[PDB]
């Protein structure tokens, strides 16, 4: 009995779609989200140049 | 002669002028009404504190003993702490506070 639980979207674990969670295994598709990759170095160095 | 009259007005003991009383009335009418019903009686709560906004304004007696505190106590105690036994430093400082009371902006 949770006195206080947040309102997550997929209420409890079982409801979570499984053809969803396997998307986060897909590489970043800027067409989909609009997120460019990181490659944290060669962006740490030359991000301003 | 002004200053010798101001010596007899310092060694007879200055009494707190009634301006403070009347300003307390037309200023805090609720504390006055409480006092108005409580006049004479041995008081166990200070309904004059806002009337004496500071230690020094209570120059009408000794030791900053506000007038409306000594009711129930002995008349001899009221005589002890009245303007009659104020030390000479006490009386000079009494005049000082009274005047710094009526010439100051905020107390």
């Amino acid at each position: 009995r949770f006195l206080l639980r947040p309102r997550w979207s997929p209420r409890t674990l079982q409801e979570v779609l499984d053809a969803d969670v396997m998307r986060l295994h897909t590489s970043l598709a800027y067409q989909d989200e609009g997120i460019a990759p990181l490659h944290v170095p060669t962006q740490c160095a030359k991000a301003n140049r | 002669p002004v200053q010798k009259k101001r010596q007899e007005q310092m060694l007879y003991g200055i009494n707190i002028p009634e301006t403070r009383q009347m300003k307390f009335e037309q200023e805090h009418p609720l504390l006055a009404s409480a006092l108005r019903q409580l006049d004479g009686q041995p008081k166990g709560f200070p309904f004059w504190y806002k009337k004496y906004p500071t230690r020094r304004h209570a120059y009408g007696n000794r030791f900053s003993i506000p007038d409306e505190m000594l009711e129930g106590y002995g008349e001899e105690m009221k005589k002890a702490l009245s303007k009659e036994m104020m030390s000479i430093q006490e009386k000079q400082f009494a005049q000082e506070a009274m005047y710094m009371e009526r010439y100051a902006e905020h107390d």
Binding site: - | L30, A34, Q37, L38, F45
Partner: protein
């Protein structure tokens, strides 16, 4: 023995929650004082009782509400404040220390300055070395008495004239003229940097009882 006294106290505080959960038009200014004097003289809680043979040591959590069940003094006799003084004095002799959010409620139930001064003088005689929160809740009572005065006068006027007046509105907002412990300057009624504005209004029965119901339903799940 004194365990029999505690068993008696069990019944006592039962029939005290009885008296306290009335919240009725059938419990008025004389009926409450009659019932409270009845319970005092029934359980012999007059301080004359010896150390043993006395109940109040186990009237836990109901003694204070009995103590404050009698605050509006019976406008019938001078035996109003004597029951409150006997109550408090038995509490002192036992040595239980009276909560400040209980004396705040003694005052938050007072009717007029006569009764407020009556409670304070009772506590004077009842060996309660005074705090500042005590003085402050006393002044808060002394102020709310006049707040309610002005609110009554302006209700009267609003009925008799039909609609709100300039003065009624500026009272409603700005509050009482030249208020001691003013509300628009909130840095003024703080003791230990917490707000002691509890006698701001009348605290009913459920006002006190909520202060403990949240406490306990907070206990049970926190």
């Amino acid at each position: 023995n004194e365990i029999s006294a505690m068993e008696r106290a069990s019944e006592a505080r039962r029939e005290i929650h009885d008296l306290w959960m009335s919240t009725e038009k059938m419990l008025d200014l004389e009926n409450r004082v009659r019932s409270v004097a009845s319970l005092i003289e029934k359980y012999k809680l007059d301080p004359s009782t010896p150390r043993e043979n006395d109940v109040s040591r186990g009237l836990g959590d109901a003694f204070d509400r009995l103590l404050l069940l009698c605050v509006p003094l019976g406008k019938d006799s001078s035996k109003g404040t004597d029951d409150l003084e006997r109550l408090m004095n038995l509490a002192g002799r036992n040595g239980r220390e009276i909560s400040v959010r209980t004396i705040q409620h003694l005052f938050a139930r007072t009717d007029s300055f006569s009764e407020a001064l009556a409670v304070f003088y009772a506590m004077r005689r009842c060996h309660v070395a005074m705090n500042m929160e005590a003085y402050y809740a006393m002044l808060y009572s002394l102020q709310r008495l006049e707040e309610e005065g002005w609110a009554q006068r302006f209700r009267e006027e609003c009925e008799e004239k039909g609609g709100v007046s300039e003065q009624a509105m500026d009272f409603v907002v700005k509050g009482i003229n030249n208020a001691l412990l003013p509300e628009n300057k909130p840095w003024l009624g703080r003791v230990m940097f917490g707000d002691r504005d509890a006698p701001a209004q009348r605290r009913e029965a459920r006002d006190y009882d909520e202060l403990s119901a949240m406490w306990t339903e907070r206990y049970r799940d926190g």
